[model samples]
Target: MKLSDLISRWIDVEPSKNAQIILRDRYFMKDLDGNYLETKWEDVARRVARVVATAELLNPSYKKNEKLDRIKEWEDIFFRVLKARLFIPNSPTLFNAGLGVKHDLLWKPIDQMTLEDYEEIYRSRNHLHMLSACFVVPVGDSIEEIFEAVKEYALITKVGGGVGSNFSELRPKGSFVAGTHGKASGPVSFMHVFNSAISVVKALMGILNINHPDIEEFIDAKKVLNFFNLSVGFPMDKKEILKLYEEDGELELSHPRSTIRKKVKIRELFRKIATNAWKSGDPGLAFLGEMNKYYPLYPHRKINSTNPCGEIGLSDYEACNLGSIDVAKFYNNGFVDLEALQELVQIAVRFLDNVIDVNVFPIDKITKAVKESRRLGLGIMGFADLLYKLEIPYNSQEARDFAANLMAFIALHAHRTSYELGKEKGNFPLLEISRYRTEDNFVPFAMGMSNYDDEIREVMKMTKEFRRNVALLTIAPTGSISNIADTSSGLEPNFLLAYTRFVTKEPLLYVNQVLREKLNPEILKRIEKELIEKGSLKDIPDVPEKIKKVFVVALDIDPMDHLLMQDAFQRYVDNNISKTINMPQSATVDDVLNVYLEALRTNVRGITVYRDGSL
Candidate 1:
């Protein structure tokens, strides 16, 4: 179905009451001209703006900004790309930009700043409140303390910031309750109490870290999509080690220490997760150790949590500032331009570097680290689309080679540009002042080699922090921009061909004047129903093979092809990739381990696999 029609009929349906409040406070709202706008006093509105602006700016075909008359939309686009969204069907962009003293979470500070000096717009009229104060609620922490937590919950949800919890500190069920002199209930029961608080705020992103004492009991919580797991990671190292221990008979049953350790079989967890995904597609896995291990700044430190959208890893209340370049944009007019590609990398890298100064931060600590670290993520959209333009097979070795060469080329140019920018604006003060620019400095500029395959070192040039603080690549879930660019999303093959679009909310059917004159209502209905039910075109027998091959669905191909492409790019990235390894429910633990080990053996910094519809 067409995107517009799909939006009107299904995706844009009214959200719950809590969702509306988040709309009022957190996301962005806009006008027809794509100007900076405010519809209400909601902190989440800023997040909304970031998403909308990002959608328009990255995709050249965004009809919303036809004239390119405003930089404001571009600015929003920058931050939105970084804020990997957890909740879908976001609200109006201008909603949170209002003049009122919003008492909850305020807008991100980047929206009003310039690229030269990190300064807020001197507008006394604009005031946004804190969305939520972050704190740890240890596992054994009192239920009475929950009343206190609830107050913070209301404050945070009122401002539209999602909460992540690490309940590992809590004792498991049946544990002693000293105060009551009785056995205690587990974290899940407490989670129900929090769920009551969740009823108070819709779109409250909640994450349960894997290391919790009641962790297995918690894993029993059925998987659901786009709620929690949609934006979280799981630790592969722990999962793998457990498997090896189980297979090798490494534990002696007589010993209490060994007896206490039970190998929670992978298939058992995978089955439960698959069933839930089939039902609702919520609560996916998050790689806890991998996320921390793969970050450019902290290869040594462990990051146990993430921001609301699962995009930015925050040691503090930091907001990610991101931007994407349309892969198709390098297609200068009709022909591809490698030189233009190089130039684009340089320009895009510098633009992102400037974003550290130009963007907004909602909190003081966010501003402090962002200014010093200057973490900017520059990713690409339309990779599969670009390959299509060149008539390259999605799984072909040629495509893999091209991806490797392109990333390496892009990486070199990005560093050259950042080095030049460093010479001009000076390397980020944290690096320069702290002597991070020197080769031996503790936080010296990594050649961004962590994400790469071992083969990448041949072409890799060492950076003496003369290059950008972060110069690497990412594979984003290009949902909106792909729609705008009229291309296949990200690196995935096209899901379907000739999809239907619903231009209005009501089922106009044949009643609409435009519909009656221009189209067959019956045919339209048939196509729409088919697209909705199948979510793919391969099943349609009549679809041309050429088109079907180009518009390959996920199930139509072997997943190894996806790994091959990631391997090619991983040969160059500075950080781990956010890739989904679609596994069938019947996929064995051995199958999962092979892929996991292959990823590690390939020198991939981190890997996450999503077994499609497997619970």
Candidate 2:
């Protein structure tokens, strides 16, 4: 199909100059000799649409002969969604979809396959490849299991998938080893081994339990081991820790295996975490108890680890596929384009649903878990950009309300679409164990539905039977994908007004475009000078306080603002959110502690605090 034929009235194929450069360098298909195989942005869009469109043929509702027409309809919607930047799938889909690669080998046993078997298996299958960006691999306390975990980590990272391992189950440092009759080297030492191994093969992301006896070792892990991104998974019940802090009493915590124990003041541990974060920024925190409480398959399984970015808390051997809608694109004449948002949500749901079937599983257990749960993280990027367009301050009550309303709107429609798909296709295999398996017609926890009472009633009327996916929404760190969409990162404020742009071959100065568009002429000139000279808007004198508040950079906002914003969206999201509580370099350790205490109060699933200049 011609590019003009596919580019609809609403969708634009005219990409920004930086987007073109990013596509050419990272996304566009190129031969070994460096010859470009695909040129236009429409080419990539068509490729993804055509491949995912074939998923409709799997539906028994479409007759064998009617498949072509149904597929055509799907293709147009998917194409329009992509071309408009209304929705964009994760990176692997962009790189591998619509390309022919065998799926049969993925079905083969790992022991039966050769090293060469993975080259093709990892790249593409039935138009979709290893599209999932994040994985959580489980480890156990035995020597055999430790080796198996290492092998599993290699297998996943080899296929362009990122894995987060929870070494919580392992015994603490200097424990007994029955097999070798030698003192155990401990989780931290094993982490160092994995770090070196992963650095040579691929970058690995790691997580540890905050209550582990070696928690101090885990907190400052980055100082010694520089290869992995580390996080401490802490439970939400901080009342005990708070009491220990107030009384200056000894706090006792044990290893997962209960072999080693530590007694120290809770304040000391908190101080260590904060001071280390202040210096190195290695270990961010994840709210473990909060994550498991709302888990869709709560009783059946526990979430021991999250994907690399801490967005989706996955049970062992499960994977999450992520995609984001450019929220800024839905802003129409100073108001959210509700109709466009709804349309894009439906298409995005179907597109993500197609990913489950088309993806080539790197391991059999991951396939089984993903198929059973059918989890898809359909999130939003460009949130700060959207707020800027609406002239709402990120720190204000209005922005929070808008975020809650917008996410709730997205969630309701996304679940509705999933219900429709379940009726047509089938509910995920584990639906009986899912939170969505409800006796009542109305959703019990529709957090974003207060403003759309009628819509909530409509959803209840439609979703009486089953759910296509166990979880429908998550907010992820849209690192590369955001650049492709030409927007701010996922649910984050702009980090800098004047910063180095990465999309081009040469570094370019990026002044915040929305700030430039909205500010008065005199204010704009003054802000530009401040931005160039100081590289921040927080201290600019001539800019209006309203403008500064609306365009608040990440470091300028209070850490509590980050926590509350995350909580606002998490109210409607099915899974967890990945957010960094950005603290300025001069912020005190007590400030970090307050945010941690407040995060539990807000009941967010996870928190990652990054003090400036720490890394």
What is the C-alpha lDDT profile of model 1 across 468-583, one tens digit per residue?
Answer: 46434555454543443344455565544333344334332222121222335565455545644676545755545554455445555555776666666655554434455565
Report residue 155 deviation for candidate 1 (angstroms).
6.2
- Candidate 2 lDDT over 202-293, as tens digits, reads 44557777677888888877666776778777654445555566688776668655568778777788788877777877677776666767
The Cα error of candidate 1 at residue 149, in Å, is: 7.8
lDDT to native, each model: 0.45, 0.75
Among the numbered candidates, top lDDT falls to 2
In terms of lDDT, the poorest run of 10 residues in model 2 is 1-10
TM-score of each: 0.62, 0.89
Give every collision pair in model 2: none
lDDT of 2 at 9: 43
Model 1 scores a C-alpha lDDT of 0.45
